[PDB]
Amino acid sequence: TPYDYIIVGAGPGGIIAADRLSEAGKKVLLLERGGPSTKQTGGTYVAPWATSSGLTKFDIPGLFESLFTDSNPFWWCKDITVFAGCLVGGGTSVNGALYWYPNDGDFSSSVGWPSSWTNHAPYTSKLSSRLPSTDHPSTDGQRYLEQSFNVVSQLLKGQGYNQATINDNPNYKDHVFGYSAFDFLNGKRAGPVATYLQTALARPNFTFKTNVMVSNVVRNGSQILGVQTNDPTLGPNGFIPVTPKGRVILSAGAFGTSRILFQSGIGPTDMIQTVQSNPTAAAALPPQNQWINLPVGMNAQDNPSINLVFTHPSIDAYENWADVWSNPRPADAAQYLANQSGVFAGASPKLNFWRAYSGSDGFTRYAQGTVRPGAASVNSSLPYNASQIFTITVYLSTGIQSRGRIGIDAALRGTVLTPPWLVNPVDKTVLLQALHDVVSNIGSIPGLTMITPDVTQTLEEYVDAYDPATMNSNHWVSSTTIGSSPQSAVVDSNVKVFGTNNLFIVDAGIIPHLPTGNPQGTLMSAAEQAAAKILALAGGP
Numbered sequence: 032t033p034y035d036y037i038i039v040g041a042g043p044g045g046i047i048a049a050d051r052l053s054e055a056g057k058k059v060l061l062l063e064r065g066g067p068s069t070k071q072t073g074g075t076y077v078a079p080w081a082t083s084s085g086l087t088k089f090d091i092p093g094l095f096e097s098l099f100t101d102s103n104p105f106w107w108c109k110d111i112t113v114f115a116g117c118l119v120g121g122g123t124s125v126n127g128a129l130y131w132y133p134n135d136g137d138f139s140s141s142v143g144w145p146s147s148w149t150n151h152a153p154y155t156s157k158l159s160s161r162l163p164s165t166d167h168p169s170t171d172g173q174r175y176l177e178q179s180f181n182v183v184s185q186l187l188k189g190q191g192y193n194q195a196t197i198n199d200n201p202n203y204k205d206h207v208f209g210y211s212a213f214d215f216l217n218g219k220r221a222g223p224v225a226t227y228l229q230t231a232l233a234r235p236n237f238t239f240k241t242n243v244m245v246s247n248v249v250r251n252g253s254q255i256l257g258v259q260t261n262d263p264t265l266g267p268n269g270f271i272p273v274t275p276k277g278r279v280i281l282s283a284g285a286f287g288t289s290r291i292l293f294q295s296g297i298g299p300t301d302m303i304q305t306v307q308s309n310p311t312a313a314a315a316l317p318p319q320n321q322w323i324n325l326p327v328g329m330n331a332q333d334n335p336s337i338n339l340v341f342t343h344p345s346i347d348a349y350e351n352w353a354d355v356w357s358n359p360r361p362a363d364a365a366q367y368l369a370n371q372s373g374v375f376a377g378a379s380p381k382l383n384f385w386r387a388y389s390g391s392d393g394f395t396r397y398a399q400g401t402v403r404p405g406a407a408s409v410n411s412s413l414p415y416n417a418s419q420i421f422t423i424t425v426y427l428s429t430g431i432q433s434r435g436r437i438g439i440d441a442a443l444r445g446t447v448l449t450p451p452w453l454v455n456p457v458d459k460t461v462l463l464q465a466l467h468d469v470v471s472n473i474g475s476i477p478g479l480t481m482i483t484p485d486v487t488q489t490l491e492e493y494v495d496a497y498d499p500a501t502m503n504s505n506h507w508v509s510s511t512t513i514g515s516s517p518q519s520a521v522v523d524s525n526v527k528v529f530g531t532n533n534l535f536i537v538d539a540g541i542i543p544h545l546p547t548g549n550p551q552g553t554l555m556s557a558a559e560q561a562a563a564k565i566l567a568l569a570g571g572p
């Protein structure tokens with residue numbers, strides 16, 4: 032059975048592409064290597080307390096932190112060394128869900144977008160019609176567990192910040208703070224799974240298959256003939272063809288897509304040779320003379336981040352989220368079960384803030400804070416009251432110059448070959464300035480104490496002793512960046528892979544630089560735009 036589009040990976044990129052292309056009347060197959068996530072996808076991983084609702088760990092926002100503390104987390108991709116979601120929805124089924132509409136600079140030709148992409152408004156608007164921002168996700172309109180917001184707002188107001196409803200004016204971020212915004216609906220996780228996927232699934236020309244892994248595309252030189260999967264019931268020895276004018280879209284995530292390309296003889300020679308080292312994978316490669324040399328996995332960017340941990344007597348650390356699955360506070364559980372209001376209708380973040388920093392190298396960089404009750408890690412030589420802890424996670428985003436590298440190892444695992452954090456010295460300088468500014472007026476808030484790093488350790492000492500791996504912000508972008516030439520990019524303005532007739536990419540890898548805030552809003556706007564460019568590209572099905 033041939034398809035006009037075969038879309039690999041049911042993450043945000045893939046699902047949006049699948050919806051839009053299927054909406055246009057094209058015969059579309061979406062493939063996903065993992066299984067069900069939320070209730071409506073057939074998921075059954077439900078907390079004891081939540082049983083009657085059928086709402087799973089992925090459905091309930093307040094269960095977010097428990098995605099990291101489960102004894103048996105089947106949702107993480109098992110062959111990637113850093114967090115990636117491998118289930119229906121990808122990262123959007125397991126993420127914090129912080130949702131910021133992209134601003135103009137996020138789509139600027141100055142950060143590497145082609146000119147033809149800079150007018151993101153029509154696409155961003157269109158995104159907002161499917162996934163409206165909310166900073167009060169509880170179905171009663173009220174906000175809950177806000178003590179950390181209240182504390183840090185006072186800190187920030189002393190630093191000259193102003194509060195805003197963040198998504199009302201995306202272009203205005205400097206010295207702004209506000210309640211955390213999410214793409215939730217009816218007090219539950221929503222995202223593309225609850226929207227774009229549902230309108231797709233209603234169409235006779237859309238087919239969705241889960242538990243199917245794509246190893247590689249099959250190609251005759253520049254012409255992609257289809258995909259190779261591990262499911263022999265879908266075609267000869269698992270091969271699924273495209274129609275004659277058909278196209279393959281890769282949306283398997285920064286590590287997923289890069290791996291599929293390497294396994295298809297597309298990417299840096301060192302990576303393809305790594306594939307060739309596995310005799311089985313070697314047999315599926317094109318001959319070496321047809322290998323396409325592109326910077327796949329190069330230019331990898333992720334936010335540097337540093338966690339700062341504090342106590343304040345007004346804080347409610349919510350048992351450090353340790354009990355939300357097996358033994359939640361009865362009133363909170365009851366309230367959520369009844370109508371999906373209360374604590375459980377939001378994830379852990381409560382406050383977000385941003386600040387612009389001039390760069391000695393000419394690049395203006397943005398710092399971002401994400402404030403939540405509780406803390407993953409505490410290193411204090413002094414006693415502290417664990418019921419009073421909260422975290423300020425400080426990131427750099429817009430403007431940073433650091434780049435790393437992702438790829439595969441000899442076992443064909445997606446891995447960080449070169450850590451992308453603080454490669455550029457001016458990025459580190461600005462990060463330390465950003466940290467110093469956050470805590471500059473800590474003494475002006477009575478009872479506010481920084482417990483990691485404690486009083487014995489300076490911010491400079493802390494950053495230098497910090498495990499780089501722990502700086503991972505799960506915001507991988509640019510590993511198959513959009514651009515103008517195969518000398519520095521992997522896809523062109525129509526998100527087509529250089530050197531191919533009909534291979535495309537719609538996932539975070541195409542984004543040329545981190546956006547100002549957490550990236551899923553930027554990605555989803557980009558996916559809308561990508562789908563339009565693909566439909567408008569002549570010679571398609």
Ligand SMILES: Cc1cc2c(nc3c(=O)[nH]c(=O)nc-3n2C[C@H](O)[C@H](O)[C@H](O)COP(=O)(O)OP(=O)(O)OC[C@H]2O[C@@H](n3cnc4c(N)ncnc43)[C@H](O)[C@@H]2O)c(O)c1C
Nearest residue numbers: 040042064117121122127128129245284287539549550551
């Ligand atoms: C991992 C993670 C990510 C977070 C998180 N938090 C936020 C947040 O709060 N807000 C935000 O903006 N971004 C957040 N991010 C980032 C955001 O979720 C990601 O940037 C975003 O989901 C990336 O979308 P992509 O389309 O590039 O890729 P995904 O990994 O989401 O999806 C790929 C999918 O394809 C699949 N797939 C992969 N390889 C495949 C193969 N070979 N065959 C078939 N399917 C495959 C997957 O199983 C998966 O479903 C976070 O808490 C975690 C733990």
Ligand SMILES: O=C1N[C@H](CO)[C@@H](O[C@@H]2O[C@H](CO)[C@@H](O)[C@H](O)[C@H]2O)[C@H](O)[C@H]1O
Nearest residue numbers: 099127129379380401407504505506549
């Ligand atoms: O965009 C994001 N948003 C979410 C929400 O801010 C972050 O969640 C954090 O993710 C960390 C893991 O990366 C956890 O250890 C930590 O407890 C958790 O709060 C996540 O790291 C980040 O990628």
Ligand SMILES: *[C@@H]1O[C@H](CO)[C@@H](O)[C@H](O)[C@H]1NC(C)=O
Nearest residue numbers: 250251252253254255256321
């Ligand atoms: C590759 O495709 C070209 C052009 O369609 C064709 O001439 C050739 O026979 C194909 N090669 C193989 C091995 O099928």
Ligand SMILES: *[C@@H]1O[C@H](CO)[C@@H](O)[C@H](O)[C@H]1NC(C)=O
Nearest residue numbers: 343344345346416417418419
């Ligand atoms: C810990 O902090 C909480 C909230 O401030 C307070 O209720 C509790 O009594 C504190 N415990 C101790 C040891 O004082």
Ligand SMILES: *[C@@H]1O[C@H](CO)[C@@H](O)[C@H](O)[C@H]1NC(C)=O
Nearest residue numbers: 410411412485487488493496
């Ligand atoms: C943990 O804190 C101690 C002081 O309490 C400090 O000397 C040590 O370096 C810290 N560890 C790290 C890795 O930052």
